[PDB]
Amino acid sequence: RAGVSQVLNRLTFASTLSHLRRLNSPIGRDGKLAKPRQLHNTLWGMVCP
Amino acid sequence: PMIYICGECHTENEIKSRDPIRCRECGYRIMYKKRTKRLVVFDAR
Amino acid sequence: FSARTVITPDPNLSIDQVGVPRSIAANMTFAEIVTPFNIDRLQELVRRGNSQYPGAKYIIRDNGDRIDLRFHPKPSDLHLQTGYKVERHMCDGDIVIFNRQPTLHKMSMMGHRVRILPWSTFRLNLSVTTPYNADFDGDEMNLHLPQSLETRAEIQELAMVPRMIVTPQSNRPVMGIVQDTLTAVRKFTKRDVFLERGEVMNLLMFLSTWDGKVPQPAILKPRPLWTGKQIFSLIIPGHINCIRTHSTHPDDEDSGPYKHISPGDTKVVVENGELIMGILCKKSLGTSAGSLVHISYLEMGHDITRLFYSNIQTVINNWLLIEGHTIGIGDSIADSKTYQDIQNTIKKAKQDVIEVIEKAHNNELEPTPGNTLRQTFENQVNRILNDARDKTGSSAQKSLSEYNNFKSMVVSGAKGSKINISQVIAVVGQQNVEGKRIPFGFKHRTLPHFIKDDYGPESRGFVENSYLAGLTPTEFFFHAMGGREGLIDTAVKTAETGYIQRRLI
Amino acid sequence: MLRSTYCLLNGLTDRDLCELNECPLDPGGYFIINGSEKVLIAQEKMATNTV
Amino acid sequence: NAPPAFESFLLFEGEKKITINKDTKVPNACLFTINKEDHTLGNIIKSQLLKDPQVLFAGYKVPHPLEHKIIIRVQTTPDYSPQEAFTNAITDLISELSLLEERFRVAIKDKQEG
Amino acid sequence: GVSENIMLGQLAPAGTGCFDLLLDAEKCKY
Amino acid sequence: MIIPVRCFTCGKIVGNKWEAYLGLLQAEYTEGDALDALGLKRYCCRRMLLAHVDLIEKLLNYAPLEK
Amino acid sequence: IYTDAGRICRPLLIVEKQKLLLKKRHIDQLKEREYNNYSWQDLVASGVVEYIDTLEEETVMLAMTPDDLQEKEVAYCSTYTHCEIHPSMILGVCASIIPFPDHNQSPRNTYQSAMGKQAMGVYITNFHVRMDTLAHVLYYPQKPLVTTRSMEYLRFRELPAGINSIVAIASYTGYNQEDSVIMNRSAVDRGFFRSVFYRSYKEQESKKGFDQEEVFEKPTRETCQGMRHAIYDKLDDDGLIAPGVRVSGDDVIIGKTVTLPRYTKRDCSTFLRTSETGIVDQVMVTLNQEGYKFCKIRVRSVRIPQIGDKFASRHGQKGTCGIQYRQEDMPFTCEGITPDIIINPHAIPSRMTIGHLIECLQGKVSANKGEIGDATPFNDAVNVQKISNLLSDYGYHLRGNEVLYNGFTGRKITSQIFIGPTYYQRLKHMVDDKIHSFGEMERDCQIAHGAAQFLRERL
Amino acid sequence: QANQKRITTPYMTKYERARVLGTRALQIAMCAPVMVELEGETDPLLIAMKELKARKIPIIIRRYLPDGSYEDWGVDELIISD
Amino acid sequence: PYANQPTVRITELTDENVKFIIENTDLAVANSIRRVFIAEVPIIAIDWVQIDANSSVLHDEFIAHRLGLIPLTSDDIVDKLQYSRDCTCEEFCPECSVEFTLDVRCNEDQTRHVTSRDLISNSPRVIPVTSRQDDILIVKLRKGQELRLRAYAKKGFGKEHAKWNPTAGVAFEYDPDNALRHTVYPKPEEWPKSEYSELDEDESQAPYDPNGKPERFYYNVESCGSLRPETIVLSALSGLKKKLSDLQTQLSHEIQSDV
Amino acid sequence: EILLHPRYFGPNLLNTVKQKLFTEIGAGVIQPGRGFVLYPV
Ligand SMILES: [Zn+2]
Ligand SMILES: [Zn+2]
């Protein structure tokens, strides 16, 4: 597991707020079996479309 | 010699080469390089 | 020697020019051999040195030693004699290759002539955007300076932009007229366009090939008025003969009366280099085969066709300074009765889908041979809703006045299409994922807002609103679902850009 | 983690934060490691224990 | 890269304000190149020349908007010079503007003293 | 081969390299 | 930070109207009446005040480096 | 039943017997929230709102609004369990700054959500004490004239990132074709989109062995081997510049020798990272974790918008500048208003960013009425006809079109140009960061050209 | 091969035109005698194009056939089209 | 073949603006006149700044940018000053510049507004327009923050930089009832009537006049304060007339050599 | 193999290739990238 603990982006205030609320997908074993890039129906009200 | 300003109590203190950095009268460790006396000209543009 | 920076438009450059920052031109040098023909010029560049940009960076002697002119060497080594090489700074009229990644065909790397301009971007004329697939939202390009007379002559004779006008890939021109000039060309070439004496003389100031003689106006009395076709005929080179149809040319008009003397001016005829009749558009000045641009290259060659592109842009952009062009909220709005017709179409289309559902639910629906009942049902529903989209879309296109600025850009072919008009004004339509209607990602439903087993249009992603009316919240999400698929597909095909090319080569 | 309950900025008011030269609007929720602000991006995974 | 703003209107060392080239394409024609001028002087000189019935053609352009010069092309009838037309149009504009100036001064007083 | 001459930095036999030029000492007399 | 001296579009001085504008809002004017009372008729000048953010007030909360 | 961590959930209003449990008394109590003690916790504790996760949502019926609870001629659902609070809460931070996003093609909302992260503004208020390696702060940010209600919680009023600009959608001289933009030079002279760039340099003393150390001091040609044509006489005796010194490329900002194991010292001094002329803004000196002397120098340079610079509008319409015209040359209305920016109409029809057109209209109403316009999505109270009707009351053409006059000649333009105030963004990308002075696919093309002597000259 | 039994086309190719002009330009730059009255022209590449159109360039093109044989064509012997 | 003979009506005159009408001139002359109002009428503005101390929350060139935009009363002496490019002194002298001084320190416990009232100059003719109403805010100082600087104002015009533009809007109009049809309305009934419209309530346009030309031009010249609004106009007419007579001199010298 | 500088490519070309050889005739191949012509003798 890598690419966690990123440097906080300080370009603009909205950048900072969005970086503190960002989510990452599993690219490996499950990800290659999933359809992870599609906007699934169950993102409604949980994840920004 | 060099004059630096404490970042905490705002007092000046004189400091010299190789001298460790501590503020007199409050001990705080962050100093600022005052401001230059050489002239620079701006266009008001 | 190469350089890279952002590109910006410059409609006052020829298609074969590139506008180069003065700081880049100073950083790039070309080694010019000293001769009795140029020694006086090269000595001046040496005396100006690297200090003033029209100068030189090195003198290279027959010994191969280089007197570096950056760090101000003694005047007694500023002497030149025949056979020395002076590394002069790049100047107006130097030949460069100009390139944009990814390189996908030989028109991705073309010869241009340097013009040094103020400021810091590379400037290209806008016709050359299409070969490069370039635009000006942040793109950068590479400039390569050929370093020898031999490879300078190679690029001049083999690779300059005008020689690249026609591609052997498809025996077509790669450059059209584009954007403002194409929307302006169409407007300029309507019958309605009468130009006053002062306006004509202004436009003729930009026509670089013009022989200095003002044509007798199409109307002499009560007032001298020239037509737009009459000035555009001065742009068309030589004695070209061409026939085209304008994009709105009606199908019946070539068969009834008025085969000639076209009522809507929708039939283009060029004879003896003179535009007799017809509204010009993308069909006549674009990249398609047998366009007036294509025939100009075939009949007149590259050098004359270079001028043709340049004159179309410079005079007609200066005419658009009078006519103007815009788009606004007014163009996106239909009349009240158009909206009532659009709404009544949708209202019936939804009821038709409900009748299909009522038969399917009642088991009154019989499957089509070779299709499952689910395929039979989904085929019937998609037919109803796609017909409604197209019936509402034509109803929107009928609403648009001749003044409408969407229609002006669609009919010119400059930007947008009839479905963009339809989606802005009438109906965004069905949203699809993997070619199907929106999937039941929840158990037997697409969102928690719907009940289970809802196969109706709203449930499965039919956006019955236009972009002017704005989307409902479910429509907004289903339109984001369909738009994500297009973003994924773009990411996929941008991974393959050179893949098959690299393997084949 | 800055502005967590164990941070020295916790419960402070806009006046106190400006005395400390902190921005009152800064949300916290990050670490400072060797003077660099560090964010833990959340990691999606499959749920355990369910069949 | 950034030009000084005075580069738009101050002539550098050895520039001429005007240069007159005879147009070889056609008789009784000239090009005037005006350094360090823009649409402000181009458009009035052209429009005044279009009032002269012995002027057959008058037009102007700024060749490139990042460089600060005009070309004015004038064609006259035979036995009238395009240079004469250029001078005469300027004397007409100086007359019109000195008339307009005096009439604005009068209208100021009549507005201020009443 | 094209790549083979490129690896050695020689003129590729493609295009402008597919032929040779000789000085005509007879045309030089004029 | 601080109110622009000129309007960007037309050059009208607005850099002396911000304190008066705040006073008029304290007097329970609408923003519209306050802009009218200040003589900002063109919408390009009205937006110079209506959209201003006086962030210099927040920057003045921090104590200076040198006392 | 899941008590597990890491379940994503959202608050929803409870519905019972087709009625909200949220009553007027709860809103009354929440109105006094500054001095009455009532808060959101009391709304949860009263059982009026509920958190629901992504597979409890498999079991709810969600009303999208309490409209769905009203009696209807054909009843879709009679068994609603929950209601949405506001449908716009499906958006996140960067998508919540988009006005009228339900009027945009969805790919362009996605592009703004990435472009918003690159818009200059004021990133934080205490930026004077921060020694960030790179920061950009706008001189004159404005709040949007046209705003979403969610933008309140983003604190976008307090730290805005952009300026409301008078935008004409016009084909003017052609320098705005494709995605290029024309900007008013006279506005730029007045500080429109002007910004400053801060670059911070750290340097550190070290002790590498029994007789080799790095110390801050002013080098000199009579002692140091590593000296160059770089300039050292800007340094003080401590080996540091002071703030307020004007600096340029190959100026030394921190003089640092290392004693070597004619000469006796090597030079490891740090230079200005680019040739961009800046000014030293702050110099802080401290001790590191190891107790060695530690310096940070911050340099500032002002960045006036150039022809290369990139701008965007909140609707995915990014574009570089193409040229700048002074106010005399810009097109002008009867009232003498020139636009600040002219964008090309060819940016609009295939992208279908109609939200951009509605923003300009609502902004013109807002700047005249003197009232910031509500562009929240899914608001049935704001429609384009109603905005047009309001605009008519101020003596403007109801669709935002205006008669412009050509700046060069003063003639009316035959078309009436759409003009309105639009919130623009200056993006991080500037041409002064990028102006600089041949792989497999480039050789392949030069083979197809047959430019064999070029292909070997370039290799 | 002799002057007869030339089987290659009598036209100069574009690739030959490019290299002939490039090579002759460098010769003119290296003070090679110029075979035409230059009327104040000074760019060696425009002089080479002037010499090409005059058919005055003192160059022979050795064209190699895929059997390894070759034909020598004087530049003035080829049909020159640009 | 000759000059137009224009006439002026002045319909409104204040310290802030003139409304006037020019009749019987070309559109080209009318437009080049408004162009000179914006870009080629000289005024005085601060162009050189030296900052001796600045402890404010604004950086030095942020303050210097604001100082340049402060309008200075120019009416009497701007015609007297040489351009520095023409003056014989090294740097600046009274022939070419007006010296300014600012010294403020905040010592009270309450925010001090530094304003154009705090700018002081070497000569009483040439002062901030507001110092003769609220003053222009230069900066706000906290207790212990300080600002002292020396500046020089110089002659220039808006073609150099917008700070030397004397106008605060230039309204320009012609043919208010669109008889020339220089614009074409898709729906003429949707358009508001001009201030200068002469139509009745119901007719949306004048009928097309095929013989008409632009010949009555309506101006509202609003001053920013550096000049009185009616001396903006007179300076523009004098300046444009000078520009033309400069051409005629250099034009004559060429024709004196063409023959 | 004599190399001859282009300055000599006048009428006296063949005489010079001898006179130079007698100080230090085949087909003179022009070298790509250089003015010099290479004569084997
Ligand atoms: Zn201390
Ligand atoms: Zn304004």
Numbering used by the authors:
A (entry chain B): 463 to 511
B (entry chain L): 14 to 58
C (entry chain A): 361 to 865
D (entry chain B): 155 to 205
E (entry chain K): 2 to 115
F (entry chain A): 1453 to 1482
G (entry chain J): 1 to 67
H (entry chain B): 614 to 874, 886 to 1061, 1086 to 1107
Excerpt from the paper describing this PDB structure:
Although both Alu-LA and Alu-RA bind to Pol II with high affinity, only Alu-RA is able to inhibit transcription in the presence of the heterodimeric general transcription factor TFIIF, comprising the proteins RAP74 and RAP30. To investigate the principles determining Pol II inhibitory activity of Alu RNA, we reconstituted complexes of mammalian Pol II bound to in vitro transcribed and refolded Alu-LA and Alu-RA. Similarly, Alu-RA within the Pol II–Alu-RA complex was resolved to approximately 5–8 Å. The resolution of the RNA precluded building of an atomic model, but did reveal helical structure and the binding location of Alu RNA. Both Alu-LA and Alu-RA bind in the Pol II DNA-binding cleft, adopting a conformation similar to that of DNA and RNA within the Pol II EC. Comparison to the Pol II EC revealed helical Alu RNA density overlapping the positions of the DNA–RNA hybrid, specific to transcribing complexes, and downstream DNA. Additional density partially overlapped the positions of upstream DNA and exiting RNA within the Pol II EC. This can explain how Alu RNA would block productive engagement with promoter DNA during transcription initiation, but could still allow assembly of a preinitiation complex of altered topology through TFIIB- and TBP-promoter DNA contacts. Unlike in the EC, the Pol II clamp domain did not close over the nucleic acids in a stable conformation. Altogether, despite Alu RNAs adopting an EC-like conformation, the Pol II enzyme was observed in an inactive state, consistent with an enzyme–nucleic acid complex not competent for elongation.
RNA polymerase II (Pol II) is the 12-subunit eukaryotic enzyme that generates messenger RNA and is thus a focal point for the regulation of transcription. Transcription by RNA polymerase II (Pol II) can be repressed by noncoding RNA, including the human RNA Alu. Here we present cryogenic-electron microscopy structures of Pol II bound to Alu RNA, which reveal that Alu RNA mimics how DNA and RNA bind to Pol II during transcription elongation. Biochemical analysis revealed that Alu RNA binds directly to two molecules Pol II via independent interactions with the two halves of Alu RNA, Alu-left arm (Alu-LA, also known as scAlu) and Alu-right arm (Alu-RA)2.
